[PDB]
Design an enzyme around this catalytic site. Structure first.
Site, mmCIF file in Angstrom:
data_model
loop_
_atom_site.group_PDB
_atom_site.id
_atom_site.type_symbol
_atom_site.label_atom_id
_atom_site.label_comp_id
_atom_site.label_asym_id
_atom_site.label_seq_id
_atom_site.Cartn_x
_atom_site.Cartn_y
_atom_site.Cartn_z
ATOM 1 N N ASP A 146 -92.259 -6.617 51.103
ATOM 2 C CA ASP A 146 -93.265 -5.515 50.821
ATOM 3 C C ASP A 146 -93.463 -5.209 49.272
ATOM 4 O OD1 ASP A 146 -94.610 -3.320 50.634
ATOM 5 O OD2 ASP A 146 -93.367 -1.960 51.544
ATOM 6 N N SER A 158 -108.741 -4.455 38.881
ATOM 7 C CA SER A 158 -109.866 -5.166 39.093
ATOM 8 C C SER A 158 -111.062 -4.871 38.350
ATOM 9 C CB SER A 158 -110.338 -5.334 40.670
ATOM 10 O OG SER A 158 -111.325 -5.926 40.890
#
Length: 330
Positions: free
Chosen positions: A35, A199
């Site tokens: 994770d 992004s």
């Protein structure tokens, strides 16, 4: 040193991925959910409340000659999905794919919430976010990667998750045969303890690319892709019959649909998520309403590049003094 381990989807939907991890002496092999959105290595154990164990493999520290109680240390964690676990702490030897760390904090669960009990395939979590998020008290502990870093050939790990197929986690090296083209690296903020990046934009299907900054986290422990409501609405508007359902808890679409791809920007590069990766199947057995793999982050507080996005790429988690993230097509 290096390590290399195969990671395998737990079910036909790729809801999560499990990677075998050797703990203790002699080894006890548990299948852990790696994770990159948390920083605790915790396991089902001989200390876990018996009624909360249902098929998981447990770590038994009393059977490990290298286990030592970390005296006074406790841990307690709550995840974004509302699940939780807590317990005490041992140090022991932990190996992943041939890479060994001695003295790793192994957090032994005394209690786990129902979603953990109900998933017999996940024996615990191995956190790979920054150690500043580790929950051990009163002495915070380091992640497996942080402990291994100095010994690694290069201070990196890579995630190469498969679509409906096994993939690989590598530690200490970048497998140049595992991706196509070049790797595009992008800056990371560690201020929140996550692999947080920005992004450069998105496209829906064959549509034009929209240049817009989307701050979010690279999180292998989250199944879906969670993005701003504007972006998610633009995606689902291209699917006839798709709608946001408050009763189901997100966007659903007709199972008869063919989904468009979704592209996200990494600098000037582009990662394309095929439409099929966004199909999470019937909302309930036999339903013709299917659950979408792109959902709004509006109720989270952070955008999350979960498995739906990451499995479309070869992803480098660069833990150099200034960390960065790399993405390549594959």
């Amino acid at each position: 040193s290096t390590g290399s381990a195969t990671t395998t989807p737990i079910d036909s939907l790729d809801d999560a991925y499990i990677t075998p991890v050797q703990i203790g002496t002699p080894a006890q092999t548990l299948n852990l959910d790696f994770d990159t959105g948390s920083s605790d290595l915790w396991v089902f154990s001989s200390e876990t409340t018996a009624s909360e164990v249902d098929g998981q493999t447990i770590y038994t520290p009393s059977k490990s000659t290298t286990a030592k109680l970390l005296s006074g240390a406790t841990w307690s964690i709550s995840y974004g999905d509302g699940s939780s676990s807590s317990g005490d702490v041992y140090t022991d030897t932990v190996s992943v794919g041939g890479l060994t760390v001695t003295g790793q904090a192994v957090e032994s669960a005394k209690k786990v919430s129902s979603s953990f009990t109900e998933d017999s395939t996940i024996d615990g979590l191995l956190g790979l976010a920054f150690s500043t998020l580790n929950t051990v008290s009163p002495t915070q502990q380091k992640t497996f990667f942080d402990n291994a870093k100095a010994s690694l050939d290069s201070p990196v790990f890579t995630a190469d998750l498969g679509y409906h197929a096994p993939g690989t986690y590598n530690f200490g090296f970048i497998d140049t045969t595992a991706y196509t083209g070049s790797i595009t690296y992008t800056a990371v903020s560690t201020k929140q303890g996550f692999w947080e990046w920005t992004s450069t934009g998105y496209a829906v299907g064959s549509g034009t690319f929209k240049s817009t900054s989307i701050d979010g986290i690279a999180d292998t422990g989250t199944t879906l892709l969670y993005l701003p409501a504007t972006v998610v609405s633009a995606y689902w508007a291209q699917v006839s019959g798709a709608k946001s359902s408050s009763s189901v808890g997100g966007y659903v679409f007709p199972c008869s649909a063919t989904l468009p791809s979704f592209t996200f920007g990494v600098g000037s590069a582009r990662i394309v998520i095929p439409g099929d990766y966004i199909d999470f199947g019937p909302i309930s057995t036999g339903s013709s309403s299917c659950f979408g793999g792109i959902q709004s982050s509006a109720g989270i507080g952070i955008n999350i590049f979960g498995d739906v996005a990451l499995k479309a790429a070869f992803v480098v988690f660069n833990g150099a003094t200034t960390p960065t993230l790399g993405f390549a097509s594959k």
